[PDB]
Automatic annotation (TrEMBL), chain C:
UniProt source species: Clostridioides difficile
Family: Belongs to the myoviridae tail sheath protein family.
First and last residues shown, out of full length: 153 to 253 of 354
Protein name, as recorded: Phage tail sheath protein
Automatic annotation (TrEMBL), chain D:
Species of the source: Clostridioides difficile
Domain of life the protein comes from: Bacteria
The name this protein goes by in its record: DUF2634 domain-containing protein
From TrEMBL, chains E, F:
Protein name: Base plate protein
Gene: rtbJ
Coiled coil spans: none
Family: Belongs to the Mu gp47/PBSX XkdT family.
First and last residues shown, out of full length: 1 to 70 of 350
TrEMBL record, chain G:
Portion held of the full protein: 1 to 78 of 232
Lineage: Bacteria, Bacillati, Bacillota, Clostridia, Peptostreptococcales
Name assigned to this protein: Base plate protein
Source taxon at top rank: Bacteria
Gene: rtbK
Amino acid sequence: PSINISFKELATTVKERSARGIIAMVLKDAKALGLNEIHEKEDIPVDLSAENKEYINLALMGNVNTPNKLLVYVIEGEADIQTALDFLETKEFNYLCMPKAVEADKTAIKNWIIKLRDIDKVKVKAVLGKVVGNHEGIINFTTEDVLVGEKKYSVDEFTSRVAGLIAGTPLSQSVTYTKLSDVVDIPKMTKVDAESRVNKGELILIKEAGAIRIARGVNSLTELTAEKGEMFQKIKIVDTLDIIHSDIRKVIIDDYIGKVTNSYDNKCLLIVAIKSYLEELEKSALIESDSTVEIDFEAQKSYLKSKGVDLSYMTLQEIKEANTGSKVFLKAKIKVLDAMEDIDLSIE
Amino acid sequence: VGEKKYSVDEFTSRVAGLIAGTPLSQSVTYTKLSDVVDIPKMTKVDAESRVNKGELILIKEAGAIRIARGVNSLTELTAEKGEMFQKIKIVDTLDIIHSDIRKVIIDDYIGKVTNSYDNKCLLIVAIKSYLEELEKSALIESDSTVEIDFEAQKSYLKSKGVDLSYMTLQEIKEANTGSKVFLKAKIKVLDAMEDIDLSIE
Amino acid sequence: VGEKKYSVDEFTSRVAGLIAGTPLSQSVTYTKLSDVVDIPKMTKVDAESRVNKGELILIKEAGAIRIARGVNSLTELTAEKGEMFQKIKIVDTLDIIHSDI
Amino acid sequence: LPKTEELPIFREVAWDFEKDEPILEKGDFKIIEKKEALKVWIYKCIKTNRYEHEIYSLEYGTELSELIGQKYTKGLTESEASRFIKEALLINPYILEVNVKSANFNRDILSANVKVSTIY
Amino acid sequence: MYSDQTYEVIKNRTLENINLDIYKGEGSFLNNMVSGNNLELSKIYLELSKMHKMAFIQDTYNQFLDKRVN
Amino acid sequence: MYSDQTYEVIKNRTLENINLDIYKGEGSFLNNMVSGNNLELSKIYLELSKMHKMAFIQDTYNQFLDKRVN
Amino acid sequence: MKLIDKLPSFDRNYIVEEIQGAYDTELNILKEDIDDTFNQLFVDTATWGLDMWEDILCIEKKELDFDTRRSNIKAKMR
């Protein structure tokens, strides 16, 4: 009879990402007792305390941009750490801060973060007041008696403020030497002590360039191993490494697990897609433009030895063409851009 | 119609007269009737069901009274008939082409034309020309092929008992057909849309 | 599932219908279950142990309840059985080929 | 010489474009903003031809119903209906441009692809 | 007068009378009610204009003249 | 009766005649359009009252006065 | 009933229909008001208006029934 017309517009998504610009903060209050996702600015539940409101206001503004997302959960102080851990496991978080983090709570937070990053591969970063832990995922801001806008501030308050500042920091930009107009009064503190504290792996504030700014953007990790090194001393680099890891994991989970068959051509298409994503990253200045992706040939040899098939009397290309038993072995080359805070040149 | 009571047969005759005046390139569906002014109320869902029953009805649409579909009265279209045979518009042109081919064959070839390979080739050329004439009209597709029915030739040979082996398949076409003709042809009648449905971005 | 207690056989029927809806191109491993709301908490080590047993269980993965494995119920595999025979997906096409032939 | 002022956000009731019934939120008419009201306006313009109804303004409406029914050839009517839709949609100041790609001719169904560019 | 009052003019007047967040748009459901009421009101304006003349002693009809002379 | 109906009474009557689960909230654009339509309604009712006045010419000298005197 | 007929196809549901029906009832009230006023225009059909009819006649008195009002008006003139 009558057949009708229905047309709905569609626009292709560009650069779909996850766990970006997310701020997670859990506060101990006996009035709200629940989670509150903040999507609109100046969104204040009436149940929240005045100091909690100040925490939120600190989290509001960023250095360059407003943080993409701020998530707040409320529960009683008792058993706060367990429930916060459960909630953060439930929903991904780019950053974490605690208004009333005790040393034991900070240690538990760091242990949970490192456990996820090492076993669950959940690359997350946490901001802590005074923790000398041996991991780069945590952040240690050791600046006592911080006063912002002629107002007394606890260490946790300003760590939350700095985390909010970091969330609004673009990756192509920097975290070092970020002047704070809100901070007007700081205790006197010598340049030599500033250098020593920075070399201790700590984050501090200094009065420089006619303003109050930080001195370095290094990780809280004091001891960087041989494989970690100088480029892992910087939070700026671990951030982009975590971002790329999460993006690759997300796209692989969305596309290839179960849904995509295991074949040589399927592997080639997967390599092409990964190369395309790396090209997308290369368009940004975060990493170098030169990179290569390869099938992990040595892993193929190891799989053959596990199977016991002799490696002799066939071409090495046949090894790549050989079935991998519902497994994939790959190799890739990366180089994240590392650049300079302050310079030193020569003249003639 | 025109504030006048009409029996079903009267309006069926009127609709048949309307159809006779309908050009083939045009449509029968959604034909508004200015003469009809008063119609009983009948719901859209009921109209959809009645059309899906294989029936022809009138509806008040587009500020006028028109029909809903141009399908055949045939409720049950078999696998070989299908959707394109559900429409009277297609069976009409199929009947027209059938009648025209039968008429021209009766006029020209029966008895008067001798049975020969070249006579068959000329007949194929004439049929192709008629199909080109139809293709000039928008009723059918412009792509079509006509062939000698080779399998019917094989069947005729088996009836005659002449072995199919040890000669070229072309010799089968060149072989005498015993005052018979076996042919094959490809057709595709244009089938098009009443209303549309598209996509936007 | 959908804020409702379900019998084990109810979800086996649901999964069987899902698998019937699963084409041979895809594999039922790591398949998300939107309808399911919650599953009892259990250790991932026990999940891998049950995978070794061949039992199929749900898993909470990437913030979603998902299928751990498409492994067959066949617990004991002979030496010549091979790992591919542990997969319902692999034996499915073999059965289809057998039936067609 | 004067610089044009941006068009304020259009608000209206909301509905599923298949439901065609205005879905109402807790006894309050839903709020549609930015890229939600223009789609509703386009749907309203396309679904009903103005000249069927005297109340609507003459410039409003679409004239695609003439081609509805398979009255002419698909190939030419594709190009004709492209301009018909462009005329019917370009009336809205919000809409910037309309781009039609192609048409699918199959049985008694037509499928086409059209594009819209907007401000927000 | 009533000749000045037309569906378009009173439609615009009613649209101005409404202080609403919804921007005025052609074919709007709310605009649909407003336009329908304005059309009927313009018809009523025409009726009022007619009953101006019909109420007069002159330009009467057979029944009007009959009533007047009775 | 033109004088019997006034702006607010018929406004409230129109609001009551609306039978929906939608709560009738003051300041709503729906209430605003009811207000505008009732504004035009009050205008037309007042003009009808003025028509009656002009027909009786109790005040506001008119051409009707001259014709009735004639 | 008239507005819904003038209304588009996609506005054929009750949500649209309620406002139109209420306004149509109101406009029926308005049109019967027009009818009553037109009756008031003619002295014979006007019942309550006979009082200021007599006021135009510059004669005032309490009156029982409109027929006597019309009779007194007819007697007053000529």
